[PDB]
Write a protein that binds this ligand. Sequence first.
Ligand SMILES: NC(=O)c1ccc[n+]([C@@H]2O[C@H](COP(=O)([O-])OP(=O)(O)OC[C@H]3O[C@@H](n4cnc5c(N)ncnc54)[C@H](O)[C@@H]3O)[C@@H](O)[C@H]2O)c1
Ligand SMILES: Nc1ncnc2c1ncn2[C@@H]1O[C@H](COP(=O)(O)OP(=O)(O)OP(=O)(O)O)[C@@H](O)[C@H]1O
Ligand SMILES: Nc1ncnc2c1ncn2[C@@H]1O[C@H](COP(=O)(O)OP(=O)(O)OP(=O)(O)O)[C@@H](O)[C@H]1O
Ligand SMILES: Nc1ncnc2c1ncn2[C@@H]1O[C@H](COP(=O)(O)OP(=O)(O)OP(=O)(O)O)[C@@H](O)[C@H]1O
Ligand SMILES: Nc1ncnc2c1ncn2[C@@H]1O[C@H](COP(=O)(O)OP(=O)(O)OP(=O)(O)O)[C@@H](O)[C@H]1O
Ligand SMILES: O=c1[nH]cnc2c1ncn2[C@@H]1O[C@H](COP(=O)(O)O)[C@@H](O)[C@H]1O
Ligand SMILES: O=c1[nH]cnc2c1ncn2[C@@H]1O[C@H](COP(=O)(O)O)[C@@H](O)[C@H]1O
Lengths: 157, 482, 79, 80
Amino acid sequence: GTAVYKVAEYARRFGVPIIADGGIQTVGHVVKALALGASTVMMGSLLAATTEAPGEYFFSDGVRLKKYRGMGSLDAMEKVKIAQGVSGSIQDKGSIQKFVPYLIAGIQHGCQDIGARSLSVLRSMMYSGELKFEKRTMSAQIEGGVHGLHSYEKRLY
Amino acid sequence: GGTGYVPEDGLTAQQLFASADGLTYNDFLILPGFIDFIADEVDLTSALTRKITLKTPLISSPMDTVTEADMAIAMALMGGIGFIHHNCTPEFQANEVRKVKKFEQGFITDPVVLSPSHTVGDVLEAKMRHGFSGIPITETGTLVGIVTSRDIDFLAEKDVMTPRIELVVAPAGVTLKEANEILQRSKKGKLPIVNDCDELVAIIARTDLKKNRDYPLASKDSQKQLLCGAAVGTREDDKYRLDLLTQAGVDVIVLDSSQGNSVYQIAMVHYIKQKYPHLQVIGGNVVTAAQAKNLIDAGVDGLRVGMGCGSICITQEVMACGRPQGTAVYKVAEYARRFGVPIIADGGIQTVGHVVKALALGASTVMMGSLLAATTEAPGEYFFSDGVRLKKYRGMGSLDAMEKVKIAQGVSGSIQDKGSIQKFVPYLIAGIQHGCQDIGARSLSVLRSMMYSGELKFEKRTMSAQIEGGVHGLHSYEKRLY
Amino acid sequence: GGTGYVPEDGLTAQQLFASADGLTYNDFLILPGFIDFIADEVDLTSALTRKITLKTPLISSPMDTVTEADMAIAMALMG
Amino acid sequence: GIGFIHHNCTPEFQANEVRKVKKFEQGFITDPVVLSPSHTVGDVLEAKMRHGFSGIPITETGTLVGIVTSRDIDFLAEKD
Ligand SMILES: NC(=O)c1ccc[n+]([C@@H]2O[C@H](COP(=O)([O-])OP(=O)(O)OC[C@H]3O[C@@H](n4cnc5c(N)ncnc54)[C@H](O)[C@@H]3O)[C@@H](O)[C@H]2O)c1
Ligand SMILES: Nc1ncnc2c1ncn2[C@@H]1O[C@H](COP(=O)(O)OP(=O)(O)OP(=O)(O)O)[C@@H](O)[C@H]1O
Ligand SMILES: Nc1ncnc2c1ncn2[C@@H]1O[C@H](COP(=O)(O)OP(=O)(O)OP(=O)(O)O)[C@@H](O)[C@H]1O
Ligand SMILES: Nc1ncnc2c1ncn2[C@@H]1O[C@H](COP(=O)(O)OP(=O)(O)OP(=O)(O)O)[C@@H](O)[C@H]1O
Ligand SMILES: Nc1ncnc2c1ncn2[C@@H]1O[C@H](COP(=O)(O)OP(=O)(O)OP(=O)(O)O)[C@@H](O)[C@H]1O
Ligand SMILES: O=c1[nH]cnc2c1ncn2[C@@H]1O[C@H](COP(=O)(O)O)[C@@H](O)[C@H]1O
Ligand SMILES: O=c1[nH]cnc2c1ncn2[C@@H]1O[C@H](COP(=O)(O)O)[C@@H](O)[C@H]1O
């Protein structure tokens, strides 16, 4: 968040747009990244393990999992070394053609909650002080999720 | 001189929120003051709206797994109120509001009645369907005698209709004491009620009076019926629903919505205030004072505060928008008390301490969804898993509730049984009273007066302070609240 | 005058990063504003570079388990 | 068929069991809990909490004056 805000603030002085690259896990992360000044949001793992993603699904513990690894992992440098990445597995998400519209609708509903009819208007509100923010202690984030239940199922789309 | 000297220890509510951290209920404590009274003198009288006033700051949330006729009735009996959900056809909700408005404290609601042009098998069907087998039959529907269980237990065929010997009835309408007397003096089970025309208007079943307790905290309107609320949306279809709901005599309308500061909510507020100037409208949800200002100008009578804090909510990790609930409650209540509007701390309540903190930060009423769900008055039927009785509890923005492009802002889950409202809400009331006594406030109005004047002091809690503030250092333990 | 009055609630993005904590996405929220339109009027048009312009702010990362011809095609189809 | 009462009990216990069988009478009651007018309204509450029924055919000492049943006590809070 800090990186995105600071680099976007410096780069908007020169009309350069930046790309919030990494750490995206929900649609809310996308809305926050776009609100802090990122013009585009690059997603690696939110898109991996879909039908359009390279590699073939495998199986483990009865869930369809593709492979997801970092370009700085060891298993990817093999194509003294210091791995700056990790190789792992992501459960199937479906297809891009049914997932990316979910993100688009989520981004739109978030931007409507905010009160911004456009992403350019969203960033205009952010830079002019009209868009307000709010920190969250760790308790506020625990409360901001799902709590107080015995068990539950979360369906996004 | 005058007033005295107390040392300054702790933060005021203004200093507590000056650091602009996202404080929530678990993040702070209230420092104790001076006890000069007992816990039972605490006056929990709360302002639900500008003109409505309850005797218990509890509300049940308009969710389809929380509030229907049963819980609304229970809550209004215990001193609070309920808000019937609108995840149903408008006539369903209006019928629920009516069912509440005609509860009448010991009589029967919607009594299954039959007619002489029936068989002796219809009463067997009623037994297998509803549960009772004593029916006050009469001409067509809703006075000839009653057919009860002790009239059919020696038959094996479906064609008993007790004659007019039951001179044990009430003339027009009697108190519960008169009914107690007539039952003691008449020794039978059904006590039908008649009028000058001598038609079935009401009926009393003996099992009711055998366990009819008292409810001193009334929550009743002028005509002495229970209060009831109703969630209506803000689309075009909801004006018809609002018509049906005011025809049933609903006392208060909450504009059910995630983000209540829209042109739609303001339009609907204006429509309601222009059409039924007697209706008390509650707008929400709002977490900032700008939203509160828009809605208070529009003319709401109360505000409903909370966005993302609910137990089944995922709005914040989906829409990225919300506020920590302690901060939201404090800020919106501080802005709304400038206009005499009372707010409703809506969401995130999990203990009695959360209720005391919400009321201390300025909330006049505290709305509870999951703290009340999975009780006996809550809609839906218990199921089983891992040997614990669990009802269903879901969010009105979940997928399983929109199914009655799509983005779920809620989650469906299960809550273990809590018991009944009539034994749980008194636990909360006693807890609120003992908390308010620890604080040193003899009423909720005095509590908020202490908070706004700097007399009530607060205290933050690092995460370590919250770990320590719970149960720790034990091998294993059992926590019984009540 | 001629701009209205809204109460000040919450931090601006400048004040949010003035404390110099290491804030990330999970550390803050956006406070809501005024809805005067529907969710489907939101124009997600984004500037990828100085001259390129997409209609959806999403990109797939250049990683060997994410983007090849198939996902690139799909992503460009979705905007 | 038939049963055979065990004798892992005192002889009087087993004889009482044999008697209880020999006087079953098909629809009547065996060992009816009966009270006497020189009792309180609390003895019937004790009978309810002990056996389960609350309808007792009271009479002079044991085993005829009328019966006291459940629908005669459900509006009282004192033991006379
Ligand atoms: N934190 C919260 O309080 C919270 C959060 C999410 C969901 N919910 C519950 O979810 C329920 C419904 O889900 P929701 O979040 O989408 O609320 P909602 O009923 O307001 O959803 C309606 C959607 O269409 C728009 N809308 C409302 N009225 C409209 C009108 N006349 N014309 C055009 N558009 C209109 C709104 O922007 C909204 O996106 C609500 O009853 C609410 O109780 C509550
Ligand atoms: N016609 C009726 N209509 C609606 N509710 C009734 C009716 N009769 C009894 N009840 C309600 O349902 C409950 C059951 O009544 P109750 O069991 O005491 O008498 P009953 O009808 O004779 O049943 P049973 O023969 O099993 O004893 C009552 O508490 C009362 O609230
Ligand atoms: N107000 C009443 N007046 C006169 N008779 C009544 C009245 N209520 C019920 N009865 C009659 O008294 C008899 C007994 O009915 P009652 O309601 O007292 O018990 P029940 O629920 O029918 O059966 P049980 O005694 O096993 O619970 C019935 O024949 C019934 O017709
Ligand atoms: N004095 C009694 N002594 C022994 N057994 C009795 C007695 N009264 C009832 N019972 C027996 O115990 C059972 C109790 O059923 P019953 O309906 O007759 O109780 P009751 O008189 O209606 O009191 P309650 O209202 O508590 O049910 C009967 O099946 C019967 O076999
Ligand atoms: N043979 C009987 N003759 C006259 N009165 C009786 C007789 N048996 C019971 N009663 C009386 O009639 C009334 C009805 O009581 P009854 O035995 O029918 O049911 P109960 O067990 O008392 O209550 P419930 O209906 O819940 O079972 C009682 O006041 C009782 O004193
Ligand atoms: O091997 C790696 N080590 C560390 N970071 C990587 C590596 N490969 C890719 N990345 C970055 O991680 C991002 C993945 O996004 P995310 O996993 O969805 O958070 C990519 O867009 C790259 O910027
Ligand atoms: O579907 C939903 N998604 C997010 N929040 C909801 C939803 N339905 C109800 N709520 C809110 O969550 C509250 C539930 O309170 P709680 O679960 O006891 O914290 C309700 O009073 C509503 O304000």
